[PDB]
Design a protein around this ligand. Sequence first.
Ligand SMILES: *Cc1c(COP(=O)(O)O)cnc(C)c1O
Ligand SMILES: *Cc1c(COP(=O)(O)O)cnc(C)c1O
Lengths: 514, 511
Amino acid sequence: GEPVYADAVLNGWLTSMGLGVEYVRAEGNTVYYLDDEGREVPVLDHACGFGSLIFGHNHPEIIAHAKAALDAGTVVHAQLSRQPRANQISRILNDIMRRETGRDDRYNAIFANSGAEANEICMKHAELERQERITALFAEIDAELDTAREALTTGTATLDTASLPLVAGDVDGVIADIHRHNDERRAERPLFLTLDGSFHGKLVGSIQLTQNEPWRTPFTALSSPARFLPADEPELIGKIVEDERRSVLTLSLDKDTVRVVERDFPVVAAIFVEPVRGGSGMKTVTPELAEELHRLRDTLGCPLVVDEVQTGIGRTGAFFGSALLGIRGDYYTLAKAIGGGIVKNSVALIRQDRFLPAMEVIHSSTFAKDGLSASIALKVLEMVEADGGRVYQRVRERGQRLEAMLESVRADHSDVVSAVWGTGLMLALELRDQSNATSQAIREKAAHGFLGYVLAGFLLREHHIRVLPAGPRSGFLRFSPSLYITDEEIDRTETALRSLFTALRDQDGDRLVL
Amino acid sequence: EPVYADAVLNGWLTSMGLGVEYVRAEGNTVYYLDDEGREVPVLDHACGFGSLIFGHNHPEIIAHAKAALDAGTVVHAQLSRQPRANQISRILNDIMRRETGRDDRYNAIFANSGAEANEICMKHAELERQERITALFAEIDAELDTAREALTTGTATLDTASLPLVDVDGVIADIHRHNDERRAERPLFLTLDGSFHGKLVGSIQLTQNEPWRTPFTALSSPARFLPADEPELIGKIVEDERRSVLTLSLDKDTVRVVERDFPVVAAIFVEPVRGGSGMKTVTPELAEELHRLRDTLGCPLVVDEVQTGIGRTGAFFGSALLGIRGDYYTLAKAIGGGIVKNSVALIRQDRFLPAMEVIHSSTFAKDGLSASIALKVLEMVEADGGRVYQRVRERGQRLEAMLESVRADHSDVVSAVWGTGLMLALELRDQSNATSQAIREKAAHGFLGYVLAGFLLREHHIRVLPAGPRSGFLRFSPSLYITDEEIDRTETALRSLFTALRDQDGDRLVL
Ligand SMILES: *Cc1c(COP(=O)(O)O)cnc(C)c1O
Ligand SMILES: *Cc1c(COP(=O)(O)O)cnc(C)c1O
């Protein structure tokens, strides 16, 4: 009935899913809402900012640091001055990367405010690399034209007319039609390669790189497209990228004879990959696929960009998921957990032998590289590295525990659960399709793509546990809690799930759907 | 030695005379350490490029933030009820009504930066454009259906003079072919000359500055930059951009293929006060041209207030001050209170498409901490019957006067004072023909303003930063707590600078 200035549709929808609740306080792995009588009810949080809260909500040590930084009158806005904290942060990340990959590469850091902004820095820099490639090729092509003409008009060579259906009739005329052709091509828009089910952001550039169809397809006309390569079938990937070859024309001299010929054009600006893929449902990159991506990157001459916005800061059980999994990228990006659960920060890391110094003075952003997020970033890095790397060891063993009880629930409920996916504290259950379900109310939700959200509402209202779905038809349930998740909390989750998947088995849509 | 960020950026700042690290900040003052380790106070006229309307680290904002942290505010609460967003949007809606007189209502989508706010608007504009497109293409079908069942059932003949635009069935196919090429063509954005709307893949296309933009041209839809001083040229430029689709029109007896307008323009962007042109305000003449265009093309007018907003012009909304009736608005910078990162797109509710609010999202957006701080900042700028704007206006008047008085005595080097409220700038006269070789070389490289800012820093301990595409303006956008004595110290600093520049003393200016 009444005026409403945000969230109306979003709120309506959440309520019907059974998720209309306001959390008023948070600490550790627990968030609180108020019941009818005004009491705080504790809820266990498995969503955790979609992975942002590796140390839980409002970790005391991070809050203290932030308050100290505020109390010291940290310079938050200090644009175009010396801010050595950036260098300090990038130095630490560089060290960690060496230690986890064995490789001795060095990286330059550009800081931003979100994961999508980090990736789009990489997009932009990739296009800078591509333009350099293009300038170098076109320069060569000129000199190949020059040489062919001063051989063709000075005596010494003839133009083989079998070559001519690429473009003819006459010398200067053919040069023009080649210049024409190449310029059309040069100004054509680049292509990005990404993986099926990829999620790389939702901004004008980065949304094109995100699989999910209702999120992307409305905005298709805005920005350069990506091809989504199939992860399970690496053998199809070679052919798909071949289809995307485009050539430019030039004149090649063989002392005596001159021919017009095709010559490779760089259309692909970059290849993007997630070590663990949210939108496919926490599926990790296989060694097979990593090797295909390395081939492509070697073959095309473009950077491989490793999106660690979600997988990074320890959640997989190393700092870098890529290092765990053996993905040798050329750019890396980071965000989410680096803000410590309280602020917004992100970073692109770009290898220094590819880095183009223009980028450092032609890209900028008002909020980026601020002092407060900077200081908090140094803190978070301090904390995950502490005590000889014992934090990763705790991530790994907490993850092992949680994967086991998840695997044990599957085993008893395989009629509704297909698979457990993921690694470390970044895990998911795959639900079996329920579009053919007995219960009319369940089946209708499944048809609408809302099954997972509905199940998450059951978990909430009946077991006070907060889970959120992943995947394009909300067909996965995500678990990415903090490393402080207790065994008793993991037991309470096992109880909750067995209850859920027994109701689903029984097809009890009265209980599941509101 | 090894170096992991900022090497080139730092090298450059040092040579401009701006290589300094600020270690602490309070009010309108930031501090660096001298050779002996003493804190040196510097007056800050840059102020986060306008973010610090209440100065660095305002006690009242710091206290609020610490309290919010101490209460265990829910920062990450995605996909739950976060009523603070609604509360923030409600307040902005009330302020807008009071300043425009208009009784329009606005929906809020929150983001993490000004560029993200604007790109929400870009995206939503394209959603509006796709709806337009679906409606037109639907009509065109029914115009085709009707023409064919008239052409094959007896009753009409196809006028063959029309045909060099494109058998019957063959022509339908070639029309469908044609229209689909057009449909998938990329949209156009209109913006103003010298516009700055962001530096992300989408928003960079909307930013004039050439070395920032032109490397990335191929990535995203282009914008046409319309000339602000010459509104009369704008009509023609937008005409050149017309594109048609083909359809079949029946005149009972006779049937003709004809051109029909296609919506290519997704949105028009404008800043009430234009950073990249050097704090030039939109004239009534130009506002009226923009209103024409928007009425004419059927696309939204997007008002970028990322910089001009939260009071800096002397109203909350610069657009309201200046009479720009936009359809979307965006806000950022000062709404983060000088300590956090927040932004918002406001979109009118009769244009708003509800899909947007469940198909766009962002991990950091709408977080609890920035939210609470946003409510605080709004509290503060609205307090005491609107006395804060009155103070912005009268502080701005003071500062504009001494700037205007410096110009008058140094018009041989200063062209103009631009801007309004506490958002002001001096325009420098071209020095590419300067006597001093060192000055002239810097001016040629586009580095003149930065060099002058280094003089101001090292000799008068004042922090100014340039604006404009050849760094040919000096910006002044201090906090509303700027004192008269601070404004006097700036007048002294400038007279000194512009006397050295007059004398062409490149030993003193260029280092
Ligand atoms: C700074 C600025 C922007 C971009 O703000 P960010 O937070 O850096 O994205 C957009 N428009 C104007 C007028 C600006 O001054
Ligand atoms: C959430 C996410 C992003 C986007 O991060 P934002 O800060 O919300 O822009 C990018 N990549 C992955 C893998 C993500 O999970």
